[PDB]
Design a protein around this ligand. Sequence first.
Ligand SMILES: [Mg+2]
Ligand SMILES: [Mg+2]
Ligand SMILES: [Mg+2]
Ligand SMILES: [Mg+2]
Ligand SMILES: [Mg+2]
Ligand SMILES: [Mg+2]
Ligand SMILES: [Mg+2]
Ligand SMILES: [Mg+2]
Ligand SMILES: [Mg+2]
Ligand SMILES: [Mg+2]
Ligand SMILES: [Mg+2]
Ligand SMILES: [Mg+2]
Ligand SMILES: [Mg+2]
Ligand SMILES: [Mg+2]
Ligand SMILES: [Mg+2]
Ligand SMILES: [Mg+2]
Ligand SMILES: [Mg+2]
Ligand SMILES: [Mg+2]
Ligand SMILES: [Mg+2]
Ligand SMILES: [Mg+2]
Ligand SMILES: [Mg+2]
Ligand SMILES: [Mg+2]
Length: 61
Amino acid sequence: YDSADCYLDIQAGSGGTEAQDWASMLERMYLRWAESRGFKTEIIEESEGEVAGIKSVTIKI
RNA sequence: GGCCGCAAGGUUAAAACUCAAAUGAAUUGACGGGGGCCCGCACAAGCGGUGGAGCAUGUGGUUUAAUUCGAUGCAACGCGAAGAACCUUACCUGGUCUUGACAUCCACGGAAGUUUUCAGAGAUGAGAAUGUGCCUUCGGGAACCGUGAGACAGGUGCUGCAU
RNA sequence: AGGGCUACACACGUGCUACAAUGGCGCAUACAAAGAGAAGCGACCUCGCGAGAGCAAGCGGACCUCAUAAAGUGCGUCGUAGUCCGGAUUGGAGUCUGCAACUCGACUCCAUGAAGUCGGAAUCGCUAGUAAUCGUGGAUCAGAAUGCCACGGUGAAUACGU
RNA sequence: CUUACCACUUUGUGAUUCAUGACUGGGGUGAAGUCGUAACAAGGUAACCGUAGGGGAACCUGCGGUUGGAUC
RNA sequence: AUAGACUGA
RNA sequence: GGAGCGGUAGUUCAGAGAAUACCUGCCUGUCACGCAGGGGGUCGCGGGUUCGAGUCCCGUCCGUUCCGCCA
Ligand SMILES: [Mg+2]
Ligand SMILES: [Mg+2]
Ligand SMILES: [Mg+2]
Ligand SMILES: [Mg+2]
Ligand SMILES: [Mg+2]
Ligand SMILES: [Mg+2]
Ligand SMILES: [Mg+2]
Ligand SMILES: [Mg+2]
Ligand SMILES: [Mg+2]
Ligand SMILES: [Mg+2]
Ligand SMILES: [Mg+2]
Ligand SMILES: [Mg+2]
Ligand SMILES: [Mg+2]
Ligand SMILES: [Mg+2]
Ligand SMILES: [Mg+2]
Ligand SMILES: [Mg+2]
Ligand SMILES: [Mg+2]
Ligand SMILES: [Mg+2]
Ligand SMILES: [Mg+2]
Ligand SMILES: [Mg+2]
Ligand SMILES: [Mg+2]
Ligand SMILES: [Mg+2]
């Protein structure tokens, strides 16, 4: 699968809302890194956090 | 498990495991959709605005080689900035330098300086002339430019949760 | 050295100008305060429709310059229309600083003439020379204010009360 | 030789105790999850006790009792 | 008359 | 296998609309709730009639039903 398209799943953990914000900060830099490499970005699913951030994101790169 | 009861259940009554506390009275604050008494353009009475339009300016976001850094409820957002074409500039691209742009200090060479060409976007580099002066134990040098050290310079680099 | 901080599918904050008749425009005519000026303030005269240009006094200033204040008053006109409102945007031609206004300054002249007809939820300031409104000056600064700081002109309404 | 006593051993049925057993009831710990906000102020329907019923859940309601309830 | 909730150094 | 019903906003339902949902701006110290302004599907898929089709007709996937028996 070295040349296969990758699918990234980011789920928040310990930290609650702050963890969700950290997850949102984590996915943003992954998307920007993929854009810099030229890879296509596709938001498969994102379950927005209750207060801030997103609990879980699945993005196809 | 035993006894009692139609039943609901009552009475007697543990163990494993887990924690370093649980708890009572009182004290100082803080808070209450508790009480009482007051103050402020805080409401109430008025006047004029913003939110709709265009433009100026700042910020978040996006973009970008860079879109420099900081300020984020009131108490950030015409804020640091009482003023970015160059400079400022701390950012990016490219061309360059490496005791250095900026300081002390050692030794050596030179006055310092003032003008002309020269190739480069410029930094810089190659020259060419001009003067080569002043205090002066006339013995010195003093200043100001270069060379070679190497102790050092340098940072708008991080932490305002060390100050 | 050049470029960027001025980038632009958007959102927010603070302001300026308007949506006009308590007004636009043309003519005439009164009343202020405060402040700065020597690599600076710049008179008078001449030229340019204009921004400004040439020449050249005065002043280190209660002396000279910046420097006609506007709102106001009189007359005329416009006559309720996106208009003789509004001046965004754009084309052309210029002036000034500065080595150099392409990115990216200010201003002038001709031309064009956008939205905007009083703004939803919501929200702000003000108790007297205050609010509202009108001009003037200064710091920064070679050039670059609708921002900041200060100066005066007209000048209200309302407060039963907690 | 025989009788009596009697150990080993055999049968049936109970008791007690240990280990284990598909499944199942509650209990204790969570540096983060979902649903509410029941208690602490008069906690926003005063709280609690016994009892009965009801409800995802903390809990709600009826009857009696207490102050270990504020304002008045 | 209505009015809920603030994880973890 | 036979006889009917359907298939439409992300979902559930009407015939291109409603509720929920989703943005944006408010309120709030922040979220929720609440207020205000918006957008969102071209009718499961194909053909044919029709000047004209989500609609009418046929075929096809797709789910829903009832029946499929007597020796
Ligand atoms: Mg028992
Ligand atoms: Mg009021
Ligand atoms: Mg506006
Ligand atoms: Mg910034
Ligand atoms: Mg810093
Ligand atoms: Mg620059
Ligand atoms: Mg430079
Ligand atoms: Mg501190
Ligand atoms: Mg800037
Ligand atoms: Mg500009
Ligand atoms: Mg003076
Ligand atoms: Mg006009
Ligand atoms: Mg219009
Ligand atoms: Mg007062
Ligand atoms: Mg000035
Ligand atoms: Mg200036
Ligand atoms: Mg005034
Ligand atoms: Mg409660
Ligand atoms: Mg209660
Ligand atoms: Mg009940
Ligand atoms: Mg009694
Ligand atoms: Mg909750």
